[PDB]
């Protein structure tokens, strides 16, 4: 029973750690596209 509880817990932990890395990579890409967009607006607000 405990040997099954061990294996299941670790597999989940690994699956979560893989999901985190993917979400962190996406977030970084979204943070870059934002700073690019933000700057274009600071330029556009200045042309006004």
């Amino acid at each position: 029973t405990i040997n099954q509880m061990e294996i299941s817990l670790k597999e989940e932990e690994i699956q979560l750690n893989e999901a985190t890395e993917k979400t962190n990579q996406l977030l970084a890409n979204l943070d870059k596209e934002s700073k690019k967009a933000n700057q274009k607006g600071e330029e556009v607000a200045a042309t006004n």
Partner: protein
């Protein structure tokens, strides 16, 4: 001047959306990290 203000207003909307998506991505990241920590403790406790 009118067209610039519209595009300035546009980017401010996009700017804020991308920040809000960033904050959501970080909160998701934290929740997954907390789950990943609990699963590892279950992992270790089972091996012992």
């Amino acid at each position: 001047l009118e067209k610039a203000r519209e595009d300035l207003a546009q980017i401010q909307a996009y700017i804020k959306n991308l920040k809000d998506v960033y904050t959501k991505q970080m909160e998701e990241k934290n929740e997954l990290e907390m789950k990943a920590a609990k699963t590892k403790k279950k992992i270790n406790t089972a091996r012992t």
